[PDB]
Design an enzyme around this catalytic site. Structure first.
Site, short mmCIF file in Angstrom:
data_model
loop_
_atom_site.label_atom_id
_atom_site.label_comp_id
_atom_site.label_asym_id
_atom_site.label_seq_id
_atom_site.Cartn_x
_atom_site.Cartn_y
_atom_site.Cartn_z
N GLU A 1 -103.26 -11.87 -80.12
CA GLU A 1 -102.64 -10.63 -79.65
C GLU A 1 -101.12 -10.78 -79.52
O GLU A 1 -100.54 -10.54 -78.46
CB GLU A 1 -103.26 -10.18 -78.33
CG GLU A 1 -104.70 -9.73 -78.43
CD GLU A 1 -104.84 -8.34 -79.01
OE1 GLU A 1 -103.82 -7.64 -79.14
OE2 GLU A 1 -105.98 -7.95 -79.35
N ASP A 2 -100.50 -11.20 -80.62
CA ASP A 2 -99.06 -11.34 -80.78
C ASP A 2 -98.47 -12.49 -79.97
O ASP A 2 -97.24 -12.61 -79.90
CB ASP A 2 -98.31 -10.05 -80.44
CG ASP A 2 -98.84 -8.87 -81.19
OD1 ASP A 2 -99.35 -9.07 -82.31
OD2 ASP A 2 -98.75 -7.73 -80.67
N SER A 3 -99.28 -13.32 -79.35
CA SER A 3 -98.74 -14.51 -78.72
C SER A 3 -98.34 -15.53 -79.78
O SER A 3 -98.72 -15.43 -80.95
CB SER A 3 -99.75 -15.12 -77.75
OG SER A 3 -99.76 -14.43 -76.52
#
Ligand SMILES: [Mg+2]
Ligand SMILES: [Zn+2]
Ligand SMILES: [Zn+2]
Ligand SMILES: [Zn+2]
Ligand SMILES: [Zn+2]
Lengths: 56, 48, 10, 1176, 45, 56, 69, 53
Positions: free
Chosen positions: D788-790
DNA sequence: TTGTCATTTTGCAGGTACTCTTATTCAATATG
RNA sequence: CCUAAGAGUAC
């Protein structure tokens, strides 16, 4: 609308979120500084006198 | 209502002045408006 | 309308 | 090369672009507009009007003194000096920008004007006309009327002629571009304000409910006059099915819509045939005649000019004029108020009648479905007010105020018969304060946000801010006419999406020129004057417009346009002038006004030698430009102006861009007609009639979008995201950041120029002042901590300096004269004789109350010690004595911030009072929660950091600096990210630089072939081993260098918690903001979510115990809170009800108590009762 | 007393409380306080 | 917080970093990413609120 | 600003190879790739460490010192 | 430090300088040494003194 | 002793949280 | 301290 239906409250924190595959579904990771700032009042009881004294 | 709202009470003859908690102080805008109201009232009273 | 975009009317 | 006249290639155009940016620069429009304002507009403002005449009549009771006097004051030439500063001691000396910035001064220069005073005398003989004569008392003598702020690097600034060495000496960054003002030590930039163009007729349809179907309007305005907006509207009453289709005009200062034929007869055209000739230019166009007959039928009642003038005067809203003078009033309306942009004098009735006929013609054409209604979003109909026009109108208003004040003072001193002095007359504070207030605050008056604090977070951020345009408020859409003038993808995502725009790289704004030479050229070359124009004898005549003023007709428009083009292409006509020939409409429009946005283009001519169309520019000009550039880094100089003056390139705006055909690239579109499958599909347009050629398509982008590598391989919202996000990138904003006391500064430790670079980014100095680093990125689902975009950042890489930053913060503090001897003093406060001393330690302060540089400071520590005098001899608070004559006004460090004090600067302000600035430096090291992003809108925060031994490694021992999730790729379709990673890998291996320009012929297949020639897998995959076990990963990992920016959003500046803290004084609720230790808002819809959960007690606890719980007493008789409760004495009493035993206490929010008291103050009784009087 | 440096001369001056903040060498009105004498510790990490 | 699932009771786990950490599966009801999203934390201050927060 | 001491990814010391790199570029007229290979930077991590560095410190040195001894 | 670089910038650069460690086993960790801050049994002291003459 | 139909005036409010910076507080003539 | 304005983050 600005002070009765919704108002600023104490005992609240806000910060950036990150993912953790090693946390349970109902768990949330809290920074130690936030945990040191936010507090809960626990009534002194014979059942929890020792640990509350230790925390004090 | 006979007890709580009669029509003649829609006409203002006495202004209830809110306490300073309502208009805390650099005075608040309400304090300046109340000062203006008092000035106008005194002017009208002297003219009469 | 609305407001916005009274009513109509009122 | 060897051949001088050989055609150029697509590579050669970059030489032309280089020459352009060698002459223009990046902020050329700001400096050009300001130079135009200073050089010419100030003199025009001064000379126009500003001739104060006061006629003191004789008022002769006796004939002995029947003499009437007349005092006149005139303003001559205006002199603007170099910027200088006054001082407390009165010594005036030259002021430099890197002194005004430090000392909070204003970089302004004084203005002087040659004031000439004359007096006339006449004998007041009744009946005889007065004749005034000089008395030979001609006194003239410059006077100081104010100070004009000067933008940096302008013609009147000290840095205009400075060399690089001089700029280094003056503590000025050579990369600094100027184009901004210094107001009170703050850098202010004037955002280009968008508006609709004036003196253009626009016809719009109207909705069904409205009675008027079509409206033709012109926003008439004159540049060299009162500069007032008068809106003339011509409206067509009646729907399509209606029969009474009468056309009516809305004249200014008239309460009703006058019929058009009445206006024609008032102007002096009585016969119906002449009116229809003035309106309709075609006898055969019987449809227009049929549609227009209702107008003459309506106006048949008036058959005389005087009758029409009387009619207009009767409709006049003044209603204070006698019947015979109504004619004069109407004449004044039709002379000084009707179509002012044409003329203000008399004797030009025919011209205004012709223009009205033209407006009605346009309206009827739109109503007859012969032309579409005008598009309001057409960018050729818009003007950008730059610093020049904005300062011009503000100064016009301000100088009008000053001259009215001068006249009032003169009248006062002549009526009181006192002596007259020039110094007592002028008030330079008027102009100075007005300009300083308009530039210091956003508002532009006495609009908002016209002037904004210049953004100095990054060099590209500053450049984008200096080329920004704002539209006051579908207007948000990207219009077709925006091509090549504003950036297609650079706009805020919020409410300003589309309203705020950024100029393209090569787009310029015209500064406006005098149209008199062009009018003289037109008259000489055979333009028929409009006064003696009869449409019947010249049916196919092209109407010639100059700045929206119909000046006449021409019978041979082709030759006229050809000679005008030749004159503009040899420089005889200013190249900013735009000339448009509409063949279908038979119109010729010439625009010379300011605010028009244009761009340069190559010129294509017949080139009979080659037998086909070709660019005018050849290899010889390219060679000369290259020679000049090499000499700059002895032959004759060849600059961009040389190309302009020899007819090689041309300036085209949107209006002229309507009537041209442009070739996208020369090498593929000019010459007449086994292809690489990897190359993108292009077409030749199957047409050879081009008039111009694009210098380069990649010049349609703006400053921020020119940093994107391969922007044509990305989904457009990703390009918009990167454009908005590179302004928040961290780098080196200026080279002289060590001598600037900016409020906040962020600097990378090791900025790196991108491996994948564009050709347009070496004019933006991005390779000299980079704002990112080349991190080794692996795209892998490694540990699940980058979902999740980490992102997973290498901890070892961080330890070695990756993305490390310096952060500077400056605190400013002044001592102010509260009175004659109530001056503040910087000192170390002592607890013995000081009040309100903060809980922070004062130990670090030495004698003068300023921490010496090098001392570590933590949060809440006092860094500036200041005290102010107060009234003594007061005892209270328990520990307040007469010794406490000083109140503490110290400045502590931010509660959440700490670091080393870097520098402190002591000086004197404008008033001469000592003030200081303290710059504190800390180091920001990347950690979990910091935000990083590639150049393709792939934002994300650091999820976790692994050390080197835990990261996956290739067979060569290379470990990634970053790991990003694969799932970010497919949905967002950021193919440019992958292509740029591959290109950067190839460039790093081969030592060259990757050419990631948008519209080049660089394909993935060629990059893959080079990578395979380097011994790696052609598609960038690498066999990687798991860090923990060393076993091979079953899936090969996409691996390679990629350019990443560290964004300004760090977690340490956002984390915030509050158990209990300061409360608002009014509502007794927690204050707002983490800077004030505030509380989070538990808004309405959070309460709704808690209601949905059914947790009533938690909601009550949130709204009462967590925020504000107030115990208030009421009585059971009246529900009001008018209960006097002496709790200690245990006495409760409601006066009026006269009860003492019927009192209750309730717990309500203090906001509720305040609401009830406010309702009571507003004559409403919110009686609160504790029992039910009615059943449910 | 306390030490300052002219922002242009780069010369060292000693200023008292009553001294007007100027550089006697040139007349510049911008002065920067001198580096502290107490030792400063930095972690090389 | 458009719906009740965007406001839920979690169990605290004190962690040594400056971000809130949450399971990946719970991000869908919150409509939360990790590209800079911030989130809020409220602490009940009584046994009744604590119990109904844990049981509802 | 000034050449990094070590390559960020692998940790090879590259802070002593900046002046040699510039000398190879200028005196010997070698292209960047051959000069990088000559200094021993074989992995592209080190190659991007040295190749993409911007020596801003020269600009900083142009300004006159604030505290001159 | 009258240079153009920040103090912690130079400190970081110095911390990244490789030093000879052939006999590092004869040195002790500073955490388990009896000295106060640093002594000769657990540290090596260097001095960088440069002037732009 | 009842319908008629046909112009002229009538009120407005715009999502939820959160961060930061900058400016400004009526100027000036007039009387005590 | 209040007010206003501007810029920005996540939707
Ligand atoms: Mg998000
Ligand atoms: Zn009562
Ligand atoms: Zn000096
Ligand atoms: Zn390496
Ligand atoms: Zn030791």
């Amino acid at each position: 609308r600005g002070n009765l239906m919704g108002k600023r409250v104490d005992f609240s924190a806000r910060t950036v979120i990150s993912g953790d595959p090693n946390l349970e579904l109902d768990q949330v990771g809290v920074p130690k500084s936030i945990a040191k700032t936010l507090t809960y009042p626990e009534v002194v009881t014979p059942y929890n006198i020792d640990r509350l004294t230790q925390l004090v | 209502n006979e007890v709580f709202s009669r029509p003649e009470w829609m006409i203002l003859t006495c202004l209830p002045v809110p306490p300073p908690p309502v208009r805390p102080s650099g005075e608040d805008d309400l304090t300046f408006k109340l000062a203006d109201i008092l000035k106008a009232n005194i002017s009208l009273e002297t003219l009469e | 309308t609305x407001p916005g975009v009274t009513x109509p009317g009122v | 090369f060897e051949d001088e006249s050989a055609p150029i290639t697509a590579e050669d155009s970059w030489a032309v672009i280089s020459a352009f940016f060698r002459e223009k620069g990046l902020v050329s429009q700001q400096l050009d507009s300001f130079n135009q304002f200073v050089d010419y507009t100030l003199q025009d403002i001064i000379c126009e009007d500003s001739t104060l005449i006061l006629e003191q009549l004789a008022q002769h009771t006796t004939e002995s003194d029947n003499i009437s006097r007349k005092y006149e004051i005139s303003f001559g030439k205006i002199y603007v000096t170099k910027p200088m500063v006054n001082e407390s001691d009165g010594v005036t000396h030259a002021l430099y920008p890197q002194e005004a910035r430090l000392r909070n001064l204003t970089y302004s220069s004084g203005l002087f004007v040659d004031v000439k005073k004359r007096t006339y005398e006449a004998i007041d003989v009744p009946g005889r006309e007065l004749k005034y004569e000089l008395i030979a008392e001609e006194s003239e003598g410059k006077v100081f009327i104010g100070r004009l702020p000067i933008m940096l690097r302008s013609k009147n600034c000290y840095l205009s002629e400075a060399t690089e060495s001089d700029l280094y000496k003056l503590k000025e960054c050579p990369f600094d571009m100027g184009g901004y003002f210094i107001i009170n030590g703050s850098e202010k930039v004037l955002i280009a304000q968008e508006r609709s163009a004036g003196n253009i007729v626009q016809v719009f349809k109207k909705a069904a409910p409205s009675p008027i179907s079509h409206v033709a309007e012109i926003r008439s305005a004159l540049e060299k006059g009162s500069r007032f907006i008068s809106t003339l509207q011509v409206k067509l009453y009646g729907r399509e099915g209606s029969s009474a289709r009468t056309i009516k005009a809305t004249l200014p200062y008239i309460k009703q819509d006058i019929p058009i034929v009445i206006i024609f007869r008032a102007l002096g055209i009585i016969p119906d045939g002449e009116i229809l000739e003035h309106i309709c230019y075609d006898v055969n166009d019987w449809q227009m005649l049929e549609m227009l007959k209702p107008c003459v039928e309506d106006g048949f009642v008036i058959q005389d000019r005087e009758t029409a003038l009387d009619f207009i005067g009767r409709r006049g809203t003044a209603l204070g004029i006698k019947k015979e003078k109504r004619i004069q009033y109407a004449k004044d309306i039709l002379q000084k108020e009707f179509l002012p942009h044409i003329t203000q004098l008399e004797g030009f009735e025919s011209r205004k009648a012709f223009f009205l006929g033209y407006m009605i013609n346009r309206l009827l054409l739109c109503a007859l479905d012969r032309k579409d209604q005008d598009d309001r979003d057409h960018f050729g109909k818009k003007r950008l007010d730059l610093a020049g026009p904005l300062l011009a109108q503000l100064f016009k208003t301000l100088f009008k105020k000053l001259t009215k004040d001068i006249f009032r003072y003169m009248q006062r001193t002549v009526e009181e018969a006192h002596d007259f002095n020039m110094k007592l007359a002028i008030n330079a504070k008027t102009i100075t304060s007005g300009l300083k207030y308009a530039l210091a605050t956003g508002n532009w008056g006495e609009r908002a946000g016209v002037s904004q604090v210049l953004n100095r977070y990054t060099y590209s951020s500053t450049l984008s801010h200096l080329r920004r345009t704002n539209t006051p408020i579908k207007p948000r859409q990207l219009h077709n006419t925006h091509w090549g003038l504003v950036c297609p993808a650079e706009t805020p995502e919020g409410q300003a999406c589309g309203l705020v725009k950024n100029l393209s790289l090569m787009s310029c704004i015209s500064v406006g020129t005098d149209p008199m030479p062009i009018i003289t050229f037109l008259s000489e070359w055979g333009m028929e004057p409009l006064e003696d124009y009869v449409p019947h004898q010249s049916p196919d005549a092209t109407r010639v417009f100059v700045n929206g003023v119909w000046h006449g007709v021409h019978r041979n428009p082709a030759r006229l346009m050809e000679t005008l083009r030749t004159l503009r292409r040899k420089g005889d006509i200013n190249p900013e002038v735009s000339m448009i020939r509409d063949i279908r409409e038979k119109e010729l429009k010439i625009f010379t006004d300011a605010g028009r946005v244009y761009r340069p283009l190559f010129i294509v001519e017949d080139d009979e030698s080659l037998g086909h169309k070709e660019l005018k520019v050849r290899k010889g000009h390219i060679a000369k430009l290259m020679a000049t550039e090499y000499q700059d880094i002895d032959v004759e100089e060849y600059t961009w102006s040389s190309l302009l003056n020899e007819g090689l390139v041309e300036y085209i705006d949107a209006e002229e861009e309507e009537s041209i055909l442009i070739a996208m690239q020369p090498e593929d579109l000019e010459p007449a007609e086994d292809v690489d499958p990897a190359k993108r599909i292009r077409v030749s347009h199957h047409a050879t009639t081009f008039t111009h050629c694009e210098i380069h398509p990649s010049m349609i982008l703006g400053v921020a979008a020119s940093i994107i590598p391969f922007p044509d391989h990305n989904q457009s919202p990703r390009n918009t995201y990167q454009s908005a996000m590179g302004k928040q990138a961290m780098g080196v904003f200026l080279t002289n950041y060590n001598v600037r006391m900016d409020t906040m500064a962020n600097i990378l430790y090791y900025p790196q120029k991108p491996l994948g670079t564009t050709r347009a980014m070496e004019y933006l100095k991005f390779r000299e002042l980079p704002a990112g680093q080349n991190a080794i990125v692996a795209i892998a689902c490694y540990s699940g901590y980058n979902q999740e975009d980490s992102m997973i950042m290498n901890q070892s890489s961080i330890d070695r300096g990756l993305f490390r930053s310096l952060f500077f913060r400056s605190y400013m503090d002044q001592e102010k004269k509260y009175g004659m001897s109530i001056t503040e003093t910087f000192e170390k406060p002592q607890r013995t004789n000081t009040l309100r001393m903060k809980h922070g330690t004062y130990d670090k302060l030495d004698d003068d109350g300023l921490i010496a540089p090098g001392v570590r400071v933590s949060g809440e520590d006092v860094i500036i010690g200041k005290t102010t005098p107060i009234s003594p001899d007061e005892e209270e608070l328990g520990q307040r004595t007469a010794y406490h004559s000083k109140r503490d006004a110290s400045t502590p460090l931010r509660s959440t911030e700490n670091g080393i004090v870097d520098q402190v600067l002591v000086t004197t302000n404008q008033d001469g009072l000592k003030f200081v600035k303290v710059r504190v430096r800390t180091t920001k090291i990347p950690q979990i929660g910091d935000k990083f992003a590639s150049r393709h809108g792939q934002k994300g925060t650091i999820g976790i950091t692994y050390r080197r031994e835990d990261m996956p490694f290739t067979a060569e021992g290379i470990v990634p600096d970053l790991i990003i999730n694969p799932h970010a790729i497919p949905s967002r379709m950021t193919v440019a990210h992958l292509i740029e990673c591959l290109l950067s890998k190839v460039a790093a291996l081969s030592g060259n630089e990757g050419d990631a320009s948008p519209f080049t012929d660089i394909t993935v297949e060629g990059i893959s072939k080079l990578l395979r020639e380097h011994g790696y897998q052609s598609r960038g995959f690498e066999v990687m081993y798991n860090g923990h076990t060393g076993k091979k990963l079953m899936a090969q990992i996409f691996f390679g260098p990629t350019y990443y920016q560290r964004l300004r959003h760090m977690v340490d500046d956002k984390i915030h918690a509050r158990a209990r803290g300061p409360m608002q004084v009014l509502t007794r609720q927690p204050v707002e903001g983490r800077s004030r230790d505030g509380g989070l808002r538990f808004g309405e819809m959070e309460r709704d979510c808690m209601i949905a959960h059914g947790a009533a007690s938690f909601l009550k606890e949130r709204l009462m115990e967590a925020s504000d719980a107030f115990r208030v007493h009421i009585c059971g008789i009246c529900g009001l809170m008018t209960v006097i409760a002496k709790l200690n004495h245990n006495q409760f009493e409601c006066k009026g009800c006269d009860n003492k035993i019927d009192i209750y206490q309730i717990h309500i929010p203090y906001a509720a108590k305040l609401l009830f008291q406010e309702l009571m103050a507003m004559n409403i009784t919110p009686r609160l009762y504790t029992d039910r009087s009615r059943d449910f | 007393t306390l030490k300052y440096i002219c922002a242009e001369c780069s010369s060292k001056l000693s200023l008292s409380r009553t001294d007007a903040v100027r550089c006697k060498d040139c007349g510049h009105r911008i002065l920067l306080k001198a580096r502290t004498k107490r030792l400063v510790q930095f972690e090389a990490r | 917080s458009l719906h009740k699932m965007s406001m839920m009771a979690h169990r605290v786990k004190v962690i040594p970093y400056s971000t809130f950490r949450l399971n990946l599966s719970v991000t869908s009801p919150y409509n939360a990413d990790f590209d800079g999203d911030e989130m809020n934390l409220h602490v009940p201050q009584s046994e009744e609120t604590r119990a109904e927060l844990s049981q509802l | 600003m000034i050449v990094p001491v070590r390559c960020f990814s692998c940790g090879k010391v590259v802070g002593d190879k900046w002046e040699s790199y510039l000398n190879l570029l200028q005196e010997d007229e070698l292209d960047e790739g051959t000069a990088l290979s000559r200094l021993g930077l074989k992995r592209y991590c080190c190659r991007r460490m040295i190749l993409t560095h911007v020596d801003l410190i020269e600009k900083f040195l142009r300004y006159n010192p604030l505290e001159k001894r | 430090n009258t240079t153009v670089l920040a103090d912690e910038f130079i400190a970081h650069r110095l911390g990244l300088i490789p030093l000879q460690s052939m006999d590092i086993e004869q040195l002790e960790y500073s955490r388990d040494c009896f000295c106060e801050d640093h002594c000769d049994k657990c540290s090596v002291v260097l001095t960088l003194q440069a002037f732009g003459e």
